[PDB]
Design a protein around this ligand. Structure first.
Ligand SMILES: NC(=O)c1ccc[n+]([C@@H]2O[C@H](COP(=O)([O-])OP(=O)(O)OC[C@H]3O[C@@H](n4cnc5c(N)ncnc54)[C@H](O)[C@@H]3O)[C@@H](O)[C@H]2O)c1
Ligand SMILES: Nc1nc2c(ncn2[C@@H]2O[C@H](COP(=O)(O)OP(=O)(O)O)[C@@H](O)[C@H]2O)c(=O)[nH]1
Ligand SMILES: [Mg+2]
Lengths: 207, 170
């Protein structure tokens, strides 16, 4: 069983309790703050290169190194559910302008194609994975919702106390992580795809 | 003589498959993406016995000090992209910039390699754009396939010839 927070104040209490113990350095905090301002750019380059960083400029490659290594200090003390919102391009380029019906519902053909592509399969993410402790942030309105099952001891950092966007209850996960998609269904709304996945871990494990 | 070659390029372009085709004349599919290795073999290059040294980089964890070290030690570069992946082609400019930043020599032995030529049916990068970029960079462009062996020996031998010519001055 994975903890799933049902109250914002409780989630914050749990998150703060983890954060207090991290003991992040000044440069580590700075890399993390910058990440919250620039995630889609950093993650975009990681995705463009399938995780290869040796073509990254000095500033970016140093930030990646700091982010990577900060996860040595940030682990979850228990099994936890994390929530993530995604736009259609997350399913592939062919879904980008294709996922939605004209009335805002998920197209059933698009959905069935996505289900065939991803269900009961491992998926590798080259970018860092931004998630929230709950499903009530601004990202909860995106057409794709992922519920990640993250096991006790896994690399996972509560970065809300230093985020440029406090209130998101952000839990950051390492880049180059694999997860297994266990379930894919439509919301009762018909307006969202709800994905349940089991987080497996990251390939990025510096000494 | 020992000619030191570095493989560069985005994940999944065929650096490993190219290296192993050259080294052992086999097509090796899905070699561990995050695994790097060095290879060495004696070859006859235009009637002279020499050794080639290949670093097949992984690159996912090659932080500033690591990549800067091996860019400095490297004498010639095979810059690989997949003809089926525009993003990998776009990325080639990044690897070259970072190589040029440490070597401070535009005359660095360098070949642009469009790999997966057997996948013409899935081509995303035009020959036009790649040839144009190669000319802009004053380097040769060669299309390869580690699957069919197409131009594989050629790229390694051509790069060696460039390293050799650069060593001749002086
Ligand atoms: N998305 C969330 O649920 C979430 C959670 C907590 C914090 N944040 C904050 O939001 C910002 C990051 O936003 P983000 O999560 O959209 O950034 P991201 O880099 O993960 O994604 C950027 C865009 O690309 C899409 N995308 C994600 N993975 C993809 C893939 N593998 N292939 C193609 N497209 C893909 C996303 O859906 C999004 O539209 C940061 O500032 C972070 O602090 C977001
Ligand atoms: N069809 C085809 N597939 C290739 C070719 N070269 C590599 N591959 C495949 O593409 C994927 C990535 O290859 P790999 O050599 O590991 O790329 P690397 O990450 O750059 O080292 C693997 O599945 C290879 O089997 C090629 O020339 N043709
Ligand atoms: Mg490889």
């Amino acid at each position: 069983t994975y903890q799933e927070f049902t109250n914002i104040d409780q989630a914050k209490a749990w998150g703060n309790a983890q954060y207090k113990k991290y003991g992040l350095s000044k440069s580590e905090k700075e890399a993390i703050v910058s990440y919250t301002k620039s995630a889609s750019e950093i993650n975009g380059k990681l995705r463009q290169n399938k995780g290869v960083i040796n073509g990254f400029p000095s500033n970016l490659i140093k930030q990646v190194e700091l982010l990577d290594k900060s996860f040595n200090k940030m682990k979850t003390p228990e099994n936890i559910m994390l929530f993530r919102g995604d736009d259609p391009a997350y399913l592939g380029t062919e879904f980008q302008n294709t996922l939605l019906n004209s009335n805002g519902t998920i197209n059933k053909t698009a959905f069935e194609k996505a289900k065939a592509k991803f269900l009961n399969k491992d998926r590798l993410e080259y970018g860092y994975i931004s998630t929230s402790l709950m499903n009530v942030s601004q990202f909860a309105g995106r057409p794709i919702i992922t519920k990640f099952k993250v096991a006790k001891g896994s690399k996972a950092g509560y970065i809300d106390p230093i985020s440029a966007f406090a209130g998101q209850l952000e839990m950051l996960l390492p880049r180059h992580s694999t997860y297994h998609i266990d379930d894919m269904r439509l919301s009762s709304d018909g307006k969202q795809i709800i994905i349940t996945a089991t987080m497996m871990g990251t390939a990025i494990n510096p000494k | 003589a020992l000619h030191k070659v570095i493989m560069v390029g985005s994940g999944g372009v065929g650096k490993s498959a190219l290296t192993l085709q050259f080294m052992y004349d086999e097509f090796v599919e899905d070699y561990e993406p995050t695994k790097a290795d060095s290879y060495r073999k004696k070859v006859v290059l235009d009637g002279e016995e020499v050794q080639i040294d290949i670093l097949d980089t992984a690159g996912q964890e090659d932080y500033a000090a690591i990549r800067d070290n091996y860019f400095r030690s490297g004498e010639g570069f095979l810059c690989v992209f997949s003809i089926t992946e525009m993003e990998s082609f776009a990325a080639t400019a990044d690897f070259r910039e970072q190589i040029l930043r440490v070597k401070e020599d535009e005359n660095v032995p360098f070949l642009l390699v469009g790999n997966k030529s057997d996948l013409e049916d899935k081509r995303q990068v035009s020959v036009e754009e790649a040839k144009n970029r190669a000319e802009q960079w004053n380097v040769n462009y060669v299309e390869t396939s580690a699957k069919t062996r197409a131009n594989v020996d050629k790229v390694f031998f051509d790069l060696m010839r460039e390293i050799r010519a650069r060593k001749m001055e002086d």
